[PDB]
Amino acid sequence: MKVQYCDSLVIGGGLAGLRAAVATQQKGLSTIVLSLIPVKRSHSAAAQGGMQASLGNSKMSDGDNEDLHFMDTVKGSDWGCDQKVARMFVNTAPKAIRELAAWGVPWTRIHKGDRMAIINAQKTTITEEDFRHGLIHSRDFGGTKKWRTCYTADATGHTMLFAVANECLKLGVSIQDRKEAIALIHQDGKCYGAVVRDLVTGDIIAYVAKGTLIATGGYGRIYKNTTNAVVCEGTGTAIALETGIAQLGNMEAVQFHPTPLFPSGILLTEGCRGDGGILRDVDGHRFMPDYEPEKKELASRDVVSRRMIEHIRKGKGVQSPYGQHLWLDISILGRKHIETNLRDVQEICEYFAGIDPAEKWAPVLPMQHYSMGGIRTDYRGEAKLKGLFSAGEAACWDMHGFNRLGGNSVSEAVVAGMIVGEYFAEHCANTQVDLETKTLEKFVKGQEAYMKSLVESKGTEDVFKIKNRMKDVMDDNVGIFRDGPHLEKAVKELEELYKKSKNVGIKNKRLHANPELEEAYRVPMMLKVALCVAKGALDRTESRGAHNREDYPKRDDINWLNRTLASWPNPEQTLPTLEYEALDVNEMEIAPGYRGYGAKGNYIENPLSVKRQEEIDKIQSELEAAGKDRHAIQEALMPYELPAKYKARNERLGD
Amino acid sequence: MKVQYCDSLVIGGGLAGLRAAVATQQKGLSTIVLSLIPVKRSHSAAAQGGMQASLGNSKMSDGDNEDLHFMDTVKGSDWGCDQKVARMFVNTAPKAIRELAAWGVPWTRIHKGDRMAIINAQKTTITEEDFRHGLIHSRDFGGTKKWRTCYTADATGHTMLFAVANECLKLGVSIQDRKEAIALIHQDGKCYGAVVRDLVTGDIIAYVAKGTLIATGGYGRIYKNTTNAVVCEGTGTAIALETGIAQLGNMEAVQFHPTPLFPSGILLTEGCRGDGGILRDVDGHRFMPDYEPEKKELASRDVVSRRMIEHIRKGKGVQSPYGQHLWLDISILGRKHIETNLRDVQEICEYFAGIDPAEKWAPVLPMQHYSMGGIRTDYRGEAKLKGLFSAGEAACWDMHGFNRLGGNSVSEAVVAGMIVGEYFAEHCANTQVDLETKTLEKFVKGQEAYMKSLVESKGTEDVFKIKNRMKDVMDDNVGIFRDGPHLEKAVKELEELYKKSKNVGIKNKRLHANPELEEAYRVPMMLKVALCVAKGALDRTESRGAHNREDYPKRDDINWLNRTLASWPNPEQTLPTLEYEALDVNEMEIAPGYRGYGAKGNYIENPLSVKRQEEIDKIQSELEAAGKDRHAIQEALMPYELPAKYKARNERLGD
Numbered sequence A, B: 001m002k003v004q005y006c007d008s009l010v011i012g013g014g015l016a017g018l019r020a021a022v023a024t025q026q027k028g029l030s031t032i033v034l035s036l037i038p039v040k041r042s043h044s045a046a047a048q049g050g051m052q053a054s055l056g057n058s059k060m061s062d063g064d065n066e067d068l069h070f071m072d073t074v075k076g077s078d079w080g081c082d083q084k085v086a087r088m089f090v091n092t093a094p095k096a097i098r099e100l101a102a103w104g105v106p107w108t109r110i111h112k113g114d115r116m117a118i119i120n121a122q123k124t125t126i127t128e129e130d131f132r133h134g135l136i137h138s139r140d141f142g143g144t145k146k147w148r149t150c151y152t153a154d155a156t157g158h159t160m161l162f163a164v165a166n167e168c169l170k171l172g173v174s175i176q177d178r179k180e181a182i183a184l185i186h187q188d189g190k191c192y193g194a195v196v197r198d199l200v201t202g203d204i205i206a207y208v209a210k211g212t213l214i215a216t217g218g219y220g221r222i223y224k225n226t227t228n229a230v231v232c233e234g235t236g237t238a239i240a241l242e243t244g245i246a247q248l249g250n251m252e253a254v255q256f257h258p259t260p261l262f263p264s265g266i267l268l269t270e271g272c273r274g275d276g277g278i279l280r281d282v283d284g285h286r287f288m289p290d291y292e293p294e295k296k297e298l299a300s301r302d303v304v305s306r307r308m309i310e311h312i313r314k315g316k317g318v319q320s321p322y323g324q325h326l327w328l329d330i331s332i333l334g335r336k337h338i339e340t341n342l343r344d345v346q347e348i349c350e351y352f353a354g355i356d357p358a359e360k361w362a363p364v365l366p367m368q369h370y371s372m373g374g375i376r377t378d379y380r381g382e383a384k385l386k387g388l389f390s391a392g393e394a395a396c397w398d399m400h401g402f403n404r405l406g407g408n409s410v411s412e413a414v415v416a417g418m419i420v421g422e423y424f425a426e427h428c429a430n431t432q433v434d435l436e437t438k439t440l441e442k443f444v445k446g447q448e449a450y451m452k453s454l455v456e457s458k459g460t461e462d463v464f465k466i467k468n469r470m471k472d473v474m475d476d477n478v479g480i481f482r483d484g485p486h487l488e489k490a491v492k493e494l495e496e497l498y499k500k501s502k503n504v505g506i507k508n509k510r511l512h513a514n515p516e517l518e519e520a521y522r523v524p525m526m527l528k529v530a531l532c533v534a535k536g537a538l539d540r541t542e543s544r545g546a547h548n549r550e551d552y553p554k555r556d557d558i559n560w561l562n563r564t565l566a567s568w569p570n571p572e573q574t575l576p577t578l579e580y581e582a583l584d585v586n587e588m589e590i591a592p593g594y595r596g597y598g599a600k601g602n603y604i605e606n607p608l609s610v611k612r613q614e615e616i617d618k619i620q621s622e623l624e625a626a627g628k629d630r631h632a633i634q635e636a637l638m639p640y641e642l643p644a645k646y647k648a649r650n651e652r653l654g655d
């Protein structure tokens, strides 16, 4: 038997995984990072929007702080987030940016002087004072009033990922790629590591550790149309689910992006619309103004996606051999503007769409983009399975709830990497594990037997046909608009698809470097993940954040102010077990109310919300009257935890 | 913490360790072989005499079989051996030779025709029939009537070691050199591996395994004068002893060689005397005939060493700046004979002694050569500490007792490697271990702390001065001739030396590649081993095999027909704890009697021996009368165990 030991095992080499590995390796814990691919190629590298952090350096960022970022995050989540977690996040995001700047990330900087900027309310000029020169800049992204999205020109995710990966190399972290975790090793409710398949040699190996952290990213590829890399298939989510102990949170909470290029899904940054981009239909008609006379194309991202689909259903969509879509017109912004501020989007349209955005329109359609759902953890990042932690998009730390803020996800990856990293480090250094070879052998032999069964299967089902049907079902029934009747149909077909996945037969019999065998075991995992998403959507009879039920259009704070917890205790069951974790209003700093975007009064008010709100107004008044600062007030409303290393305040330009 | 896992951990890369590793690796168990040095440089490489095995191919080997080899072995051991083990050995030695021949070992072969040979009783010509041509040859070695010592010209140990090492490379065994086991990891009476110090980097690593085997060789270097390589210091013996559970067997049983070159200890093969070599004193007087009128220089090796020392004590020794010695004269054998049959010994004397043996005499003196004592095991090779096995010279499997047959030790290394290898393999595949990180950390941190304490010690003792004094004490008081008064003195000084070893101070503070630090932790271990040898000799008031007590010249089968078991349960005690394992005469195939060499009636007969002897004669008579073969008779006298793979009979030329 092949066994590899390390003190801290990290599954996933994206921003979250690598940053957590820095946290453990720096304190002397031997750590291994496993990844399907070279870590610098992780999906995190594709982020071009930027990272949200309340620095308050620039003119449009002036006055920004933890409280404003916090409020944007909670209201954005439509109150589905754990507010204590959101607080931990907002207070640490500024330090993440500054640590990355220290590690060489080339953040775009502010230069003194006037600036030609777009505000879309007063597209006047912006002036940056001399005392702001040379500090980290920020731009308008995510719909926040205060511009706090930091960026390194047009490749933020790229530079951030490279810096963290390089720090891992500096520290001697063992980075082992083309390695896939296919099962978690657990006994007595504790996680002791993972069974890993070497993608090159086919070897099945047991990686044991005192603590294991899953930072495997999102599960967007269960959808046919997604902005996600082809490796974002949620197998990390599935291995946690297959332990029958760890639970998945809000898997039905999936966010879509309104303007990905159709049908590839290659992202066309929000900056297109933010700069003045126009959405048009089959007749070239600018339609957003018809639905949003006021906000128009500058409406909430959430709203734009919905209107686009509505317009398509009204029969104004553009027919295509790949389906229906709409048009994005940025040529109206001028050729000079595109070749200086949108030079990247220009290359994308030319390279893949074979068009020049300065002359022709780009085909677009809303597509899956971010996975709010994930492995459920406490505030420390630990799952129900002891010793198993999760961070990044793969987790449901839940600072996002049912709608993540644009710019908050790459921010969360590094922030969680830092915070969960500390708690993960503490766990690995303080816990003592009992590694029974009997258990290791059971799990390893169990997967070797499984690979053999797949290679010898005389089944007649085609793995790709099954996978493709799964993706169509998800796109057609679990998209922007959902309803009970279609969701019931989806759950039934997915369950049928799952059962047929076991009758798959492959042509290539080799155990090494076999992409066919890879699909053979990944697809069944994806189907189970899809079932959690679909079933979760079916049972959640309300409309919250990104989850929109046409048959239940209102947010129900009375019966649904909770979080969906999915599990798969019995390996024989063909549907996921769903339970619910109630959100205690008494522990909220901001009581449930209007989210800001969408129709008003579109939510069933909960009496407990009114009580808490009053209680909050009271506490604020008294404390604010006694000349108490925002910090002491925050503490009295909702105290939260933070590792000692990050409990310090964030200095700002103007203190 | 650094941890390495394998199913089968082998400590020692000599013939025994490597052969055992072949046994485990061939059945799919991941195995690691740790060694202080590249494995092909192990002491096993120095064997030039040959390997004993009852093939019966040659004329002088005609009629030889397991029974004759068995009898030579038991009588040679002066009845201190476990006869069942000796049986396991003799029946397997023939297969070891044949397996090695299959692996390419270039055994010297028989060619048809007459041959100029020395018999020393009738130095006539020997004829080899045509049906013997091309089969494995054998020579006169070890004083056995039947010539059964196989050899590959003059480098038998060398070719054997290389073949086994190469098989390990073929099988993918992980060979990790410049790695030293400094402690065994154990809990609840079970061995889970060893703490290892990387000699190059200084890293302390835990090697965990389901089973651990120690094949670390002899402890000859505790003596000033020894034929052993400088790495034969018995640290393997010491780490087993330091667990406080494993016991060491007959540590006082040390064998000397009569003709090593003085004062280097470079071995001058027994062939010198066997061919007609003459021992002379200070006046050039051939003295052996004076002590052994009959056998003369062709007397038992055991007897030659004793007479040489006796002659020296009578004042006929040659004075030298390194001590007293005697002369070996082979020039009388002729120049032509030396440059064809003893070309090797000629090179040795010229290369190191700066003399031509065909013209001048070689300085010689008896010196420590083989370690019969070692880690005590059952017949399977397992020690009292469960999961810990031992094989080769490092063990006391005890097929040797108080006197090993010349040629039986390289034979045992491979044979035990085969047999203990099978049982070791079975244990590793069938047992299930509970590896607690709490325990691993305790042992690893314990040794890191120890290395640090050695580097920071402000002691003023000199490690080399202590080591050298230990070696002088052993040579002066625990050599060929021993007595209570001197042994008491030795035990006292050694105990004093041990206590002072703790106040050693070293100059070089680095933790990596530090030969001074190496001596700092090895010497204390050697001292504990030396104490087991010295104390064991002091308490054993009898003369048996190689252990000669001048104050107790007789073999005592009444009070000493047993085996000395040494342990060190309390890490505070400064002397070893000695217990005794009694040899059951009822389980002996050959009852105690005359050993063949030395004075007759020099043993206190035990009544139980007489009873058993009669019982044996009776069983033999009845069975032999009923036309029963030697096999059935053997079974009725003393049944023994053997792995299924080796329970087959040995085909011979003449069946």
Ligand SMILES: *Cc1cc2c(cc1C)nc1c(=O)[nH]c(=O)nc-1n2C[C@H](O)[C@H](O)[C@H](O)COP(=O)(O)OP(=O)(O)OC[C@H]1O[C@@H](n2cnc3c(N)ncnc32)[C@H](O)[C@@H]1O
Binding pocket: A011, A012, A013, A014, A015, A016, A017, A034, A035, A036, A037, A038, A039, A042, A043, A044, A045, A046, A047, A048, A049, A050, A051, A052, A157, A179, A180, A181, A182, A215, A216, A217, A218, A227, A228, A229, A231, A232, A235, A236, A267, A369, A370, A391, A392, A393, A394, A406, A407, A408, A409, A410, A411, A413
């Ligand atoms: C898709 C996307 C997302 C995105 C974005 C643009 C695109 C095209 N722009 C963003 C932006 O401007 N601002 C922002 O805040 N977020 C933006 N996002 C989303 C964001 O980039 C992601 O949420 C974030 O990068 C996620 O980071 P995370 O560290 O969690 O995950 P990852 O980078 O995807 O890496 C996952 C790693 O896991 C390995 N893996 C996966 N499964 C396995 C198994 N089974 N075994 C072993 N390793 C596994 C992957 O190989 C990878 O390294």
Ligand SMILES: *Cc1cc2c(cc1C)nc1c(=O)[nH]c(=O)nc-1n2C[C@H](O)[C@H](O)[C@H](O)COP(=O)(O)OP(=O)(O)OC[C@H]1O[C@@H](n2cnc3c(N)ncnc32)[C@H](O)[C@@H]1O
Binding pocket: B011, B012, B013, B014, B015, B016, B017, B034, B035, B036, B037, B038, B039, B042, B043, B044, B045, B046, B047, B048, B049, B050, B051, B052, B157, B179, B180, B181, B182, B215, B216, B217, B218, B227, B228, B229, B231, B232, B235, B236, B267, B369, B370, B391, B392, B393, B394, B406, B407, B408, B409, B410, B411, B413
């Ligand atoms: C010294 C000698 C012995 C000898 C002989 C000639 C000489 C000069 N001629 C012989 C002969 O003709 N016929 C015969 O039957 N025996 C003869 N012998 C004795 C015989 O060679 C030995 O008994 C035999 O070779 C012993 O084999 P074994 O496999 O037991 O041991 P080894 O070869 O000495 O190797 C020991 C290994 O252990 C490693 N080691 C030791 N301590 C440690 C620690 N602490 N950690 C890690 N590794 C360790 C050594 O490095 C080595 O590889």
Ligand SMILES: O=C(O)/C=C/C(=O)O
Binding pocket: A048, A049, A257, A267, A268, A269, A270, A271, A405, A406, A407
């Ligand atoms: O439009 C983009 O660049 C990113 C959008 C998002 O992360 O939501």
Ligand SMILES: O=C(O)/C=C/C(=O)O
Binding pocket: B048, B049, B257, B267, B268, B269, B270, B271, B405, B406, B407
């Ligand atoms: O004389 C030698 O070559 C070996 C002697 C021995 O192994 O006893």
Ligand code: NA
Binding pocket: A371, A372, A373, A374, A392, A393, A394, A395, A396
């Ligand atoms: Na998530």
Ligand code: NA
Binding pocket: B371, B372, B373, B374, B392, B393, B394, B395, B396
């Ligand atoms: Na021994």
